[PDB]
Structure formats: structure tokens, C-alpha cells
């Protein structure tokens, strides 16, 4: 239990006193690129530091070897380095290859002072104890929830540390078996980074409306990946809202006034700022429920729209341009109709915030815009470095968009989200009509060879969104069971395939006990195993293990090995 939940504030104060130098910066921030919750946490830290006026440098990273080379670039004087949700499971110290004896100042009683102290907050679940406990330089923020449950694993690891006889040999072997038990497990997340960050803020008491707002945004970002985690944290967020609701009730809206509400939200992207028809149209859950990919999906969509009695031309016109006379009544109309279609689970309460007369924006809409700006804000390895630079640039653009004044940039991200949803829909319907999915009863396999936007698709987040859409489509087809989702995309500029291994996911609203148990991404372990022997020159530098870049020619033997692999 390296960092207790309550001891988070103590660690924070220790970091302060280590870097308590207004004259000289002793803090560096390292953040995983392409993570919304990471961006929210970085905003949190930035506001906290500007409260403390502590000098600091903020760096976005996407690659693990990038982290290593940057660390090499880093000056030793920097006593404060923060890691956001990346590499926690992998032994970063082993990945860093540090000597604590070099780092320790005044070992003696025993205290461990290092000229660089690196504090790691990770969202990944496996949470390697040797990573947590091997080095005191490695400072891991611990939710406790994994840690206490790891008590058996932690004591087994401690025993392994002690023992470096047949009875002791078999005890050590049993401990190793336990290790493999929590090993070979697909990493996930149960804690939105924003959540425990805001918890630490509450421990410090510096929470404002924005802090809670950004925590809401990060959790909303997590929602698709782990719906149940979002649902569990949802009452906590609502209660904190009540804690921070202004006393004034139903005051007349004025430009100065800013309000955040907890009101029913409909699982339609950009619903307020897009139309009704389109919001239904590219909604992955709506598509999967209605099979909108096929023509009969469109037929059923028209049937249900007429069932609400909404005129068509009214439906394809934007929600904001809708007359309020119908807009107020919409919710009860869905209540009457969605159930008849079974589409009622889409209605759920959400957080929508407005300022002045700009309008109300769903947190879901916000995270969609952020993801869009990340995706399309802007030799072969050098080209990949250029793409990493552009992705860092998109990260900075999204960072900037989080600022209130950049409402225009937020609208740009909105437009990018519309375009990306459109393109993802086109690609998905294209592959579905052509049946480009080829399930091998070990994993449903689809590959990207033709069609445009492969440059867009090779951007990892675009591939992830398409994967989420297709997982939703397959899951809503309960006829076929959950199977691993493997997807491979080509870039002719690199002339090599891009692969992401997506774990199967239950459909939303699946509260059954068998659906309560989450699925672990076996794809990661298969990739690690392939890298271990007979590697096809894949790239794992990316902070996501599932996403892997492979030679296009070498992907076919990779599939052969995947068929050979039994862990899939």
C-alpha cells in the first residue's frame, strides 16, 4: 500500500516541499497522450500548481521509449515527476533501469531521498507489486481497492522477496502461481483518474465547480470503456454536485451566471447541437439496436420516427432550431415510444452545463468534441515521429479547448466529431454489407486494406472508435456470443498494418450477474507472448498494449500464431 488514499495529501505536501522553489523549477509533468481523463488530471494539476505558484514543465507523451529517452533528457535536479495512468502495471523501474543507490541521498534510522522523485498515478488494474514496491523512487498512488484485495498477492510477493528446501521451494512456486493468476490478465480501469484526483483536491479542500466539472468529463470519457464504473461513480458525482450547487434556485439566466444541471440525457451524440435524425443516425447503440447499418435499419428508423409522430424534415433539422413547444414534450414521447421499441434504456440522467446565453452542452458532447480534436486536430519511423508530434499538437489543442474562452475551438471539435462519426458509420456499414468481418471462433477478425481515410483510421483513436461501434453492433446481436475483437488497418505510407486488439464488451444496460464480471483483454497477453518469441517486429511503444503496429507482410504469421495461441 505505497500511497494511502488519505496519505495522498501527505504525498502532495512532500512533493511541494521537495519542489518548494519559486526560483528554480523542480517539477516535470508526464502525461499519456490521447487520454481524456489524463487531460482532465493535467488541468487539475495545473490549477493546483498555479494556486501554489510552483514552477513546472508539462510534457505530453505517447510512447514508452519516448518516456525513457525524455527521462534521459531530464535533469537530475527535478525532484518531482508525475505520471498519469500509463505504465503502472509494467515495471517502470525495470523499464527505467534506475539505481536507487545513485538516487538515495542520506540513506541513514533510514530515509530515502532522491534528486528525482517520480510519482505515478495509474489507471491500469494489474498493478504490479514489484512496480509498486520494488523501488521507493517509484511512487505509486494506490486506490487501496486493488491493494487490499492484493494482500494475499502482496504477502506472496513479500515472501518471494524474503526467499532469494522442498517445502520452501514449493511455497515459492505456489506464490509464483498466484503471480501468474493476477498475471495473464487483461488490464482495465476501475477508477477514473479525475475521480481520485478530485478526491485529493477535496482532501485539500480546493475543489471548485470546474474541478467537479472536469471530473465529470473524465468519468464520462471512461463511461464507454467501463459503463459499470461510470454508473458506480455517478451517485458520488451527483452528491458532490449537490455539495457544490449554488443556493440560488431557478434564477433568471444572465450572462454572468453559469449553471451545471443533472437532467435526463439521451445516448445520442451531439443531440443538442446536432439534429434529431442524425443524432439517432450515428449513435452506435441506436445503430446496433436498430441494425441501422442495413436498409431495414433505416426503414425501422423511419417507422419509429413516425411513431413519435415527428415530421421528418423537422427531425433532420437541428435540435437547437427546434421549436421548444415540441422540445419540452420530447422526453415523455420517448418514454411512450422507446419502450415499445425497447429503446428506453438510452434515456438516463446526465450532467449538462451551461454558461450565460451560450447554451447547454452535454458532458458527453464535450468529451466527443475533445476526442474529435485529439483525433483530427492536425523515414517511416520519422513519419511516425511526425504523427506523434501532430498527436501531441492535437493534445495541446484539446487542452486549450478546455478553456472557457475557446468556445469556437469547442465548436470546431464538435464539427470534427460529426465528421468522424459520419466516416466511422460509412466504414462500418461498408464492412458489414461486404461481410468483411471473418470470425475464426477464437476472435472475430476484420482488416482494413481498401477504402479511404486509412490515414484517419491509422490514428489509434479512430480505430478505437470504430472498434467500439462494431463491438456494440456485435453485442446487440445476442445470437452470436461475445468473442475477441481483432482489427488491422493498413497505411500505405508506412506500408505496414496497424492492429488493435479489442476485448469483447457486454451491451449497455446488461445488469445480469454474468455481465457484472468484466472481460479482461487477452489481446495484450497474446501480443506480449508474440513479442517474447517469433516476434513479427510489432511496436508496443504506445501506451496501449492492444494497439500494435506490425509489418503488413508479417501480420499473416501473426494471425497464424494467434490461432495457435490458446489464451485468446
Amino acid at each position: 500500500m505505497y500511497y494511502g488514499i488519505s496519505q495522498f495529501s501527505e504525498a502532495y505536501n512532500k512533493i511541494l516541499r521537495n519542489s518548494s522553489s519559486h526560483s528554480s523549477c523542480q517539477l516535470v509533468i508526464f502525461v499519456s497522450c490521447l487520454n481524456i481523463d489524463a487531460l482532465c488530471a493535467t488541468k487539475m494539476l495545473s490549477l493546483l500548481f498555479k494556486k501554489q505558484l510552483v514552477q513546472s514543465q508539462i510534457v505530453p507523451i505517447f510512447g514508452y521509449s519516448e518516456l525513457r529517452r525524455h527521462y534521459s533528457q531530464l535533469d537530475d535536479n527535478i525532484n518531482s515527476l508525475l505520471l498519469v495512468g500509463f505504465g503502472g502495471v509494467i515495471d517502470l523501474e525495470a523499464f527505467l533501469e534506475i539505481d536507487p543507490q545513485e538516487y538515495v541521498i542520506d540513506t541513514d534510522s533510514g530515509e530515502q531521498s532522491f534528486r528525482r522523485d517520480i510519482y505515478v498515478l495509474d489507471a491500469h488494474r494489474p498493478w504490479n507489486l514489484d512496480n509498486i514496491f520494488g523501488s521507493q523512487i517509484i511512487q505509486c498512488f494506490d486506490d487501496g481497492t486493488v491493494d487490499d484485495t492484493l494482500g494475499e498477492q502482496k504477502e506472496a510477493y513479500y515472501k518471494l522477496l524474503e526467499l532469494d528446501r522442498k517445502q520452501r521451494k514449493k511455497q515459492i512456486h505456489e506464490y509464483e502461481g498466484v503471480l501468474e493468476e493476477y498475471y495473464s490478465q487483461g488490464t482495465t480501469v476501475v477508477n477514473s483518474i479525475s475521480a481520485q484526483i478530485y478526491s485529493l483536491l477535496s482532501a485539500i479542500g480546493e475543489t471548485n465547480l470546474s474541478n467537479l466539472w472536469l471530473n465529470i468529463l473524465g468519468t464520462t470519457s471512461l463511461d464507454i470503456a467501463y459503463a459499470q464504473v461510470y454508473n458506480r461513480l455517478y451517485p458520488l458525482l451527483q452528491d458532490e454536485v449537490k455539495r457544490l450547487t449554488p443556493s440560488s434556485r431557478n434564477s433568471v439566466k444572465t450572462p454572468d451566471t453559469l449553471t451545471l444541471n443533472i437532467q435526463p440525457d439521451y445516448y445520442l451524440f451531439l443531440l443538442r447541437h446536432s439534429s434529431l435524425y442524425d443524432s439517432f443516425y450515428y449513435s452506435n447503440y441506436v445503430n446496433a439496436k436498430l441494425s441501422l447499418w442495413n436498409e431495414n435499419g433505416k426503414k425501422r428508423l423511419h417507422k419509429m420516427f413516425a411513431r413519435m409522430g415527428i415530421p421528418l424534415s423537422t427531425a433532420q433539422e437541428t435540435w437547437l432550431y427546434m421549436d421548444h413547444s415540441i422540445k419540452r414534450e420530447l422526453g415523455i414521447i420517448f418514454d411512450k415510444n422507446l419502450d415499445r421499441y425497447g429503446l428506453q434504456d438510452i434515456i438516463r440522467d446526465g450532467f449538462v452545463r451551461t454558461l450565460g446565453y451560450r447554451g447547454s452542452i452535454s458532458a458527453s458532447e464535450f468529451v466527443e468534441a475533445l476526442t474529435a480534436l485529439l483525433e483530427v486536430g492536425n523515414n517511416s519511423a520519422q513519419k511516425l515521429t511526425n504523427l506523434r508530434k501532430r498527436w501531441v499538437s492535437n493534445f495541446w489543442l484539446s487542452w486549450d479547448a478546455l478553456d472557457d474562452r475557446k468556445v469556437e475551438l469547442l465548436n470546431r471539435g464538435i464539427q470534427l466529431a460529426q465528421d468522424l462519426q459520419r466516416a466511422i458509420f460509412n466504414t462500418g456499414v461498408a464492412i458489414l454489407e461486404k461481410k468483411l468481418i471473418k470470425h475464426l471462433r477464437i476472435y472475430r477478425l476484420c482488416v482494413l486494406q481498401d477504402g479511404p481515410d486509412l490515414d484517419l483510421y491509422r490514428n489509434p483513436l479512430t480505430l478505437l472508435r470504430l472498434g467500439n461501434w462494431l463491438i456494440e453492433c456485435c453485442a446487440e446481436s445476442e445470437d452470436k456470443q461475445l468473442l475477441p475483437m481483432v482489427l488491422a488497418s493498413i497505411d500505405e505510407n508506412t506500408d505496414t498494418y496497424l492492429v488493435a486488439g479489442l476485448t469483447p464488451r457486454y451491451p449497455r444496460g446488461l445488469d445480469t450477474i454474468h455481465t457484472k464480471k468484466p472481460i479482461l483483454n487477452n489481446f495484450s497477453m497474446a501480443f506480449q507472448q508474440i513479442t517474447a518469441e517469433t516476434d513479427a517486429k510489432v511496436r508496443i511503444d504506445n501506451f496501449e498494449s492492444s494497439i500494435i503496429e506490425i509489418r503488413r507482410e508479417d501480420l499473416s504469421p501473426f494471425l497464424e500464431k494467434l490461432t495457435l495461441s490458446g489464451l485468446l
Binding site: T254, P255, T318, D323, Y357, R358
Partner: protein, 195 residues
Amino acid sequence: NDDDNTEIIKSFKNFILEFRLDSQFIYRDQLRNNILVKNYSLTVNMEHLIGYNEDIYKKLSDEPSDIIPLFETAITQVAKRISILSRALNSLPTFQLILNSNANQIPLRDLDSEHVSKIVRLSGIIISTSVLSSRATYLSIMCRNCRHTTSITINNFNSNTVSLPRSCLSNCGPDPYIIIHESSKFIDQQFLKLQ
């Protein structure tokens, strides 16, 4: 309802006077601009109107034909309030409204028998432009035998035109109020044709 109409006018002026972004009331800004260069015209975005108050925008959409003259009167009163000293007809020409919709554009083709007297957004290419045609903003008349002279301020927001006054109106005839086209104030109109 005339008092209610005046209340709606007051609501619209509350819109324009207390709609700001970043402390900036763009409407008074364009107002003072059109005062400096005397263009009695005002530009407004309906998205802003919805953001400030949906209800006024909805009332607009219900029957813009008569909502617009009330808005013009409100803008004229606002200009009188701002650009003229307190306690200091045709003294100040009425401002006219300019709007940008950004909604969908129904094609010129396939326009419905519906949408009559309804605000619409379209696009097309001009094939012809008409010469200017004045329009009686203010009308000056006299009751002929009765000699009663009266003022009329007709707006181009109906249908077709308002018929000439009938009866004496304080027999003088079915149209005693003979128009004296000197005090009467006119504004030019131009006819357009879109392909």
C-alpha cells in the same frame, strides 16, 4: 393585447440591452456604430435570441410578419433612449432589423404550399434586379372638406396594401383624407428574382 404587445417590445429591448458576451454588449456596439454612420439598421442573430430567451424567439417564429415591426419600434425607442439626451415622429428614422439564420435551406424547388408567411432560409442566383421603389413609412393626409389632417405610419409587413382612410375619422366622404405627399416620408424598395 396592445399593452401586451408593448410588454413584448420591452422584453425585446431587454434582450438587446442585456445580451452580452464577455461583458461585451455587441448590440449596443453595432447600435453606436450605426449612430456614428447613420445607417438606421440593426443586425441580430436568432441563435443569440434563443440563448437569451427561447420564448421571444418562438413568438417570433409564430408570426414574424407582425413581430418584426414591434422589434423595429423597440430598436427605435432604444436608439432614442441611448443616443439622445433625456428630456432634450420622423425626428429619428426607424431602424430596420437584419437577421442571419444559419438553419437549413429548403431548396427553391420543392417549396411547399405550406410555409406561407413563415420565415425561411434559402439560396439562389439573381437573374434580375429592380429599380428602387419608395414606400410610405409616414403618410400625410387631410380630411378634404373636414380639413382634418392626420398622420399614418404604415409598415411593409402585411400581406395587399392598407386601403386609404374612410369616413371623416374626426359626411366627409369615403376617402376625405387626401394624401399630401410632402410631409409623407418614403423608403425605397427593390425587387429581386432568384434562380
